[PDB]
């Protein structure tokens, strides 16, 4: 019995919650020694989950949120649709 990070943070609904869920496991770090943005405790990680959730919170779409962070953090991140 562990938190996950998905555990810290305060949804506006659970429709946002499971919008985060998606895209931090649909978004990946196949590089990193963990590749589960969902998973990992690597600051990056962190830094993902953050911006996320930040950009959910601004009305951001699910497609606006993907080109995001792969345009703005393609050094490590990859989108892997499912």
């Given amino acids: 019995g562990s ?4 555990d810290t943070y305060e949804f506006a609904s659970d429709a ?7 895209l931090t496991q649909e978004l990946r770090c ?5 590749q589960d943005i969902a ?3 690597a600051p990056i990680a962190a830094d993902l989950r ?10 951001k779409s ?4 993907v080109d995001y962070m792969v345009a703005r953090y ?4 990859r989108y ?3």
Wanted: net charge neutral; aromatic share 8%; proline share 8%.
């Fill in 3 to 6: 938190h996950m990070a998905i």
């Fill in 16 to 22: 946002e919650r499971e919008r985060f869920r998606n």
């Fill in 30 to 34: 196949p590089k990193c020694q963990n």
């Fill in 39 to 41: 998973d990992s405790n």
């Fill in 50 to 59: 953050k911006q996320i959730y930040g950009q959910l919170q601004q009305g």
């Fill in 62 to 65: 699910d497609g606006e949120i």
């Fill in 74 to 77: 393609g050094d490590f991140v």
């Fill in 80 to 82: 892997k649709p499912p």
